[PDB]
Amino acid sequence: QGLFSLGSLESTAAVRIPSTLAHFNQRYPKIHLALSTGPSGTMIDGVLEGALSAAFVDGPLVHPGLEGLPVFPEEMMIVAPYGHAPITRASEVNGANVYAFRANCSYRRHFESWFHADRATPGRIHEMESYHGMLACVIAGAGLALIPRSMLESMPGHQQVSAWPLAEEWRWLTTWLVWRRGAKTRQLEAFIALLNEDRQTVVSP
Amino acid sequence: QGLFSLGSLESTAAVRIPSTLAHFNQRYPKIHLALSTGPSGTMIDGVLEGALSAAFVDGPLVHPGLEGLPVFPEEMMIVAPYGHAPITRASEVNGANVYAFRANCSYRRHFESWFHADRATPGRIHEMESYHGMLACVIAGAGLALIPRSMLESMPGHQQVSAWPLAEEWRWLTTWLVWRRGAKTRQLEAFIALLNEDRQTVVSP
Ligand SMILES: [Cl-]
Ligand SMILES: [Cl-]
Ligand SMILES: [Cl-]
Ligand SMILES: [Cl-]
Ligand code: NA
Ligand code: NA
Ligand code: NA
């Protein structure tokens, strides 16, 4: 019996990889898949140190100690209290209070940069421990949040908010699968094979 | 403009109160609803100290510094890797690895007690920071978890697990709304009124 230690972003684990995790479990009954979640920085360190076999992390891929594959396109949605007018540019919500998922620095920085590009700013940023909590604050009328569409639409509360994608250069991010630079192990190759049988559906129309 | 500081369990915030939060936001535009999440013990302390106006917490209600209302019935589901035979008693899964939501001690203790009642035990308990992460470990074949049906069925991964309710005396728990003992404030009375227009649907068939 072997061990495949896979790290993942919270959002990816929630709405992108469940089907692949089940398939891998059933395909390789003698491999123990150990799934952990955390921030990209921490996971990358775990992959580099050998504590993780691979991890789903925020792009872009820049660390020379890693190799990787771009896997999931995420559509970044600005989320507001119910019935709010479509938000198409940051000046329209200048000074608004913002709620961010603490563990995903890349999404927070992206949201901030979107404000700054239109010479606007959030009034303040509140770091939150969960997507459900973040969404509940928006539902309650407290401010705005930036959440991938895939994650947003999986949460019941999406019925109680209004959401729109960010404008083109800010609309899409990419979640990568990364591993330690070098020949892939048989287990990782096996995992990528099962994963690929799905990401054709995710990227294709 | 006033402030209503409401604490809530993660699960309750995810799948029980979104509609009520939106209604309260729209009904009282001059009240700022500040929604926080955390473990019951911490929230109760916040209510007692005056940091929170009220909180949704795990029952039963025993602290004499509080008054409260029983609100949501939660059906406790044992969750296993896909296709697993129905689990009706703990001896059937004696020694299994268990995944628990770190913040909800009451649900962890409940699960442990369910094992012990049948002279069984989990092999070990792994504390997890999120329901999605907990569910992903089960999907991956790593063990079992105890999750309220309302929460479970809201997560996409529920399609990749098999789940059954615990047997009668272990099947149902109750989430309470609690506040500091004394006359309720006008805001709390107002919140309870909007809440009551919904919990008839939650409890009734
Ligand atoms: Cl994330
Ligand atoms: Cl990228
Ligand atoms: Cl909870
Ligand atoms: Cl109770
Ligand atoms: Na396994
Ligand atoms: Na408000
Ligand atoms: Na859902």
Side-chain angles (χ1 to χ4, degrees):
Chain A
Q1 175 162 21
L3 177 69
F4 183 63
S5 301
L6 180 65
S8 178
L9 298 178
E10 165 71 6
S11 53
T12 307
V15 310
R16 292 304 197 181
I17 63 175
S19 62
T20 302
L21 294 174
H23 193 169
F24 189 91
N25 179 45
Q26 294 170 28
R27 178 62 182 80
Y28 301 107
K30 283 66 175 175
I31 298 172
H32 179 93
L33 194 158
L35 196 295
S36 61
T37 63
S40 292
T42 308
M43 320 227 80
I44 286 169
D45 285 345
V47 170
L48 294 170
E49 293 170 13
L52 295 174
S53 306
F56 287 97
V57 301
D58 299 297
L61 176 58
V62 298
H63 199 298
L66 299 173
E67 290 183 70
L69 187 63
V71 180
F72 300 113
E74 300 298 349
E75 190 175 1
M76 306 309 294
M77 309 291 289
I78 187 169
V79 189
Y82 189 82
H84 191 291
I87 299 165
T88 64
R89 53 187 301 174
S91 55
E92 297 168 1
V93 292
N94 191 23
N97 290 342
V98 162
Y99 289 86
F101 185 60
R102 184 273 305 161
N104 200 318
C105 298
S106 78
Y107 293 171
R108 179 180 171 168
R109 286 188 280 90
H110 189 77
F111 199 20
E112 289 181 314
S113 295
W114 171 83
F115 274 91
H116 301 159
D118 199 28
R119 294 171 167 171
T121 52
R124 56 190 48 69
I125 301 176
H126 301 278
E127 298 177 15
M128 310 306 291
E129 299 298 329
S130 83
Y131 279 104
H132 289 111
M134 200 189 341
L135 187 67
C137 290
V138 175
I139 293 164
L144 308 174
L146 191 71
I147 304 176
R149 183 193 293 276
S150 58
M151 185 65 197
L152 175 60
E153 296 186 349
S154 78
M155 291 185 289
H158 86 269
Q159 300 295 155
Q160 284 75 39
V161 298
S162 297
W164 306 273
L166 296 184
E168 284 316 330
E169 65 273 39
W170 307 96
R171 186 170 179 191
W172 295 99
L173 295 173
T174 300
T175 296
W176 286 64
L177 178 64
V178 303
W179 57 91
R180 198 187 329 107
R181 184 169 289 269
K184 300 163 179 164
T185 62
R186 292 314 94 176
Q187 292 176 348
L188 180 53
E189 286 182 356
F191 181 76
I192 290 167
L194 299 185
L195 180 65
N196 285 354
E197 296 172 2
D198 308 347
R199 66 157 187 162
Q200 289 190 24
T201 316
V202 181
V203 177
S204 305
Chain B
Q1 175 162 21
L3 177 69
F4 183 63
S5 301
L6 180 65
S8 178
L9 298 178
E10 165 71 6
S11 53
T12 307
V15 310
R16 292 304 197 181
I17 63 175
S19 62
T20 302
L21 294 174
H23 193 169
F24 189 91
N25 179 45
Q26 294 170 28
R27 178 62 182 80
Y28 301 107
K30 283 66 175 175
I31 298 172
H32 179 93
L33 194 158
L35 196 295
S36 61
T37 63
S40 292
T42 308
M43 320 227 80
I44 286 169
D45 285 345
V47 170
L48 294 170
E49 293 170 13
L52 295 174
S53 306
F56 287 97
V57 301
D58 299 297
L61 176 58
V62 298
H63 199 298
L66 299 173
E67 290 183 70
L69 187 63
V71 180
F72 300 113
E74 300 298 349
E75 190 175 1
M76 306 309 294
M77 309 291 289
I78 187 169
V79 189
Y82 189 82
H84 191 291
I87 299 165
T88 64
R89 53 187 301 174
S91 55
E92 297 168 1
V93 292
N94 191 23
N97 290 342
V98 162
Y99 289 86
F101 185 60
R102 184 273 305 161
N104 200 318
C105 298
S106 78
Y107 293 171
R108 179 180 171 168
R109 286 188 280 90
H110 189 77
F111 199 20
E112 289 181 314
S113 295
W114 171 83
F115 274 91
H116 301 159
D118 199 28
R119 294 171 167 171
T121 52
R124 56 190 48 69
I125 301 176
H126 301 278
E127 298 177 15
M128 310 306 291
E129 299 298 329
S130 83
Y131 279 104
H132 289 111
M134 200 189 341
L135 187 67
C137 290
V138 175
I139 293 164
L144 308 174
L146 191 71
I147 304 176
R149 183 193 293 276
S150 58
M151 185 65 197
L152 175 60
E153 296 186 349
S154 78
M155 291 185 289
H158 86 269
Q159 300 295 155
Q160 284 75 39
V161 298
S162 297
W164 306 273
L166 296 184
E168 284 316 330
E169 65 273 39
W170 307 96
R171 186 170 179 191
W172 295 99
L173 295 173
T174 300
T175 296
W176 286 64
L177 178 64
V178 303
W179 57 91
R180 198 187 329 107
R181 184 169 289 269
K184 300 163 179 164
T185 62
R186 292 314 94 176
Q187 292 176 348
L188 180 53
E189 286 182 356
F191 181 76
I192 290 167
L194 299 185
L195 180 65
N196 285 354
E197 296 172 2
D198 308 347
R199 66 157 187 162
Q200 289 190 24
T201 316
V202 181
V203 177
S204 305

